[PDB]
Structure 1
Amino acid sequence: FHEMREPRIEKVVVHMGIGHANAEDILGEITGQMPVRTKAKRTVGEFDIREGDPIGAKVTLRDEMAEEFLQTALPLAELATSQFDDTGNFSFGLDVTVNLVRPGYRVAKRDKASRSIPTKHRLNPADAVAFIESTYDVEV
């Protein structure tokens, strides 16, 4: 029961919301894999009337890539209870987002007979702080 309930890392998304790019090179270094451009929507007074066009970049890491990143990334932040989602997610900072979830998450990400994850199987902030804190760092 506990084995298929103990949290894990779905993905670690690192992104730099600039607003017009040349910053891909560092992400390609700090994470290890190719980043992708970020386009915006809706015209914007702040000389941002171009809908589709480079404005940011991000890198989504999974498995090892994700953990090998957090090992050297988490120590760079000072996690706090507020910094946590209602789903058991937390992001710090160049933004760094950590998406945590339980084993059979796929049930909501697959194509056939997908289904939404029952709140009971949904990760909790409490369960989140724990799991994480239970590995190289402090809380509040």
Structure 2
Amino acid sequence: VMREIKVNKLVLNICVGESGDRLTRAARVLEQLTEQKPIFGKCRFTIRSFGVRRNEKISCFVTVRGKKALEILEKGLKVKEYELRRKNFSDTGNFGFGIQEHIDLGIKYDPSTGIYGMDFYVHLSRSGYRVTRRTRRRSKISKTHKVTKEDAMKWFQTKFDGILL
């Protein structure tokens, strides 16, 4: 009725693993694609082998909603020609995939930038999600109202004519 399923948001992530100029170039790539100033991720712990230090900027990410989200998703699923494995769907009703080169999305090559790859993730949900996030009288969503793993596949098939391996 009004328990249809929509897209709550779309989170874009690129982990470079290092500080300096490369991270700022990746941030510029995200700004160009999404038209939003992004923010940077900070490493919780210390690991010698990956060369990560505490509080150091390692990645940059952004989140989008509404009309803009359904078309960045469209570009991403176009690059994969609407092909997703069945493993990509979590047991809660979400999914996501990846891209190895950011040029395929329509950004002109640049001798300074190089290649960057990103991740996509969707977080499907129905309406009435506000009660779990409002400050005043926040409560819980019942269980039938939640989205199951089968529904995240039926929705994909119907909406995008996608193909499940």
Q: How does 1:6-17 map to 2 (within 5 A)?
A: 6-17=4-15
How far 1:85 moved relative to its partner?
A: 1.0
2:40 alignment partner in structure 1: 37
How far 1:34 moved relative to its partner?
A: 2.0
Deviations along 1:92-116, whole A, 9 cap, x unmatched? 0111111110100111111121122
How far 1:70 moved relative to its partner?
A: 1.0
In structure 1, C-alpha distance between the alignment counterparts of 2:33 and 2:159, rounded to whole Å: 21
Is the Cα contact below 8 Å between 1:108 and 1:115 reproduced in 2? yes
In structure 2, C-alpha distance between the alignment counterparts of 1:118 and 1:81, rounded to whole Å: 26
Aligned residue pairs: how many?
Answer: 137
Is the Cα contact below 8 Å between 1:40 and 1:52 reproduced in 2? yes
In structure 1, C-alpha distance between the alignment counterparts of 2:143 and 2:119, rounded to whole Å: 27
User: Is residue 86 from structure 1 mapped to residue 110 from structure 2 by the alignment?
Assistant: no
Moved more, 112-121 or 52-61: 112-121
Structure 1's consecutive aligned runs of 4 or more residues displaced over 3 angstroms after TM superposition are: none
Q: How does 1:42-121 map to 2 (within 5 A)?
A: 42-46=45-49, 47-48=51-52, 50-77=53-80, 78-93=83-98, 94-121=118-145
Larger Rg: 2
In structure 1, C-alpha distance between the alignment counterparts of 2:162 and 2:17, rounded to whole Å: 33
User: Match of 1:123, SS?
Assistant: coil
2:156 alignment partner in structure 1: 132
How does the TM-score come out when normalised to structure 1? 0.90
Is the Cα contact below 8 Å between 1:32 and 1:65 reproduced in 2? no
Q: Which runs of 5+ in 2 are unaligned?
A: 99-117
How does the TM-score come out when normalised to structure 2? 0.77
In structure 1, C-alpha distance between the alignment counterparts of 2:161 and 2:119, rounded to whole Å: 19
Q: Which runs of 5+ in 1 are unaligned?
A: none
In structure 1, C-alpha distance between the alignment counterparts of 2:163 and 2:34, rounded to whole Å: 24
